[PDB]
From a paper:
Ucl fimbriae are attachment organelles that facilitate ExPEC adherence. Ucl fimbriae are phylogenetically related to Uca fimbriae from Proteus mirabilis and F17/G fimbriae from enterotoxigenic E. coli (ETEC). Tip adhesins are two-domain proteins; they possess a C-terminal pilin domain that connects the adhesin to the main fimbrial shaft, and an N-terminal lectin domain that mediates attachment to specific ligands, therefore dictating host range and tissue tropism.
Next, we determined the crystal structure of UclDLD from F11 at 2.2 Å resolution. At the time of collecting our data, there was no structural model with sufficient sequence identity available in the PDB. Thus, we used iodide SAD phasing, using a sodium iodide derivative of UclDLD that diffracted to 2.85 Å resolution, to obtain phase information. The final UclDLD and UcaDLD models contain residues 21–215 and 21–217, respectively. Electron density was not observed for residues 43–48 (UclDLD) and 44–47 (UcaDLD), suggesting that these regions have a disordered or flexible conformation in the crystals. As expected from the high sequence identity, the two structures are similar, with r.m.s.d. of 0.6 Å for 189 equivalent Cα atoms. UclDLD and UcaDLD have a completely conserved pocket in the same region of the structure as the N-acetylglucosamine (GlcNAc)-binding site in F17G. Of the 358 glycan structures present on the array, UclDLD bound specifically to four glycans. Overall, SPR analyses revealed the strongest binding interaction occurred between UclDLD and sialyllacto-N-fucopentose VI (KD = 11.72 nM ± 3.6). In particular, the swap of asparagine 192 in UcaDLD to a positively charged lysine residue in UclDLD could be the reason for the increased binding affinity for sialyllacto-N-fucopentose VI via its negatively charged sialic acid.
Numbering used by the authors: 21 to 42, 50 to 214
Amino acid sequence: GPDDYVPSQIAVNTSTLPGVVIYPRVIGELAGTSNQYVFNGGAIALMRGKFTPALPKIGSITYTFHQGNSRDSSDFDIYDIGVSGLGIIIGMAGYWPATPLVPINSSGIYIDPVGANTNPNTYNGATASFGARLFVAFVATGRLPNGYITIPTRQLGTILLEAKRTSLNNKGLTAPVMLNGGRIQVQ
């Protein structure tokens, strides 16, 4: 069917965090991930994605990612992943490389096109897919002990698919945004 878009997740991997050697402060960036087909399957459409955080907000911090097209600094919300002394911040963007990193500092924001945040009629150009880029950074909220800290898998939030044509917009299709657990080495 023309509106038979089906979701697929976007995730970052804890294992990509370098070894922490050192409040609150950023202790490292996970590898940025990309998925051109977070929503795929239907016919060509004008589409946009809205991210909704799923984790409690425990603080805020200024930061600039080294990975994405991040020119200025921004306010990020520190989210709780249920690990003492730790927190994470999120930044998202459209799949295409020129798009800007969208810091997550609210309960809802359009990650692509970023213009939809200031114009409710704005969608991406006609395409048969919607994708995203995911950036995550670990934050130490307090002095961390040396060793291996376990990080559980947590759903960081959800991308909601909106489209110009009402039938696809009415489906309200969503896809999950994931942090894949593992361990981090503090020294």
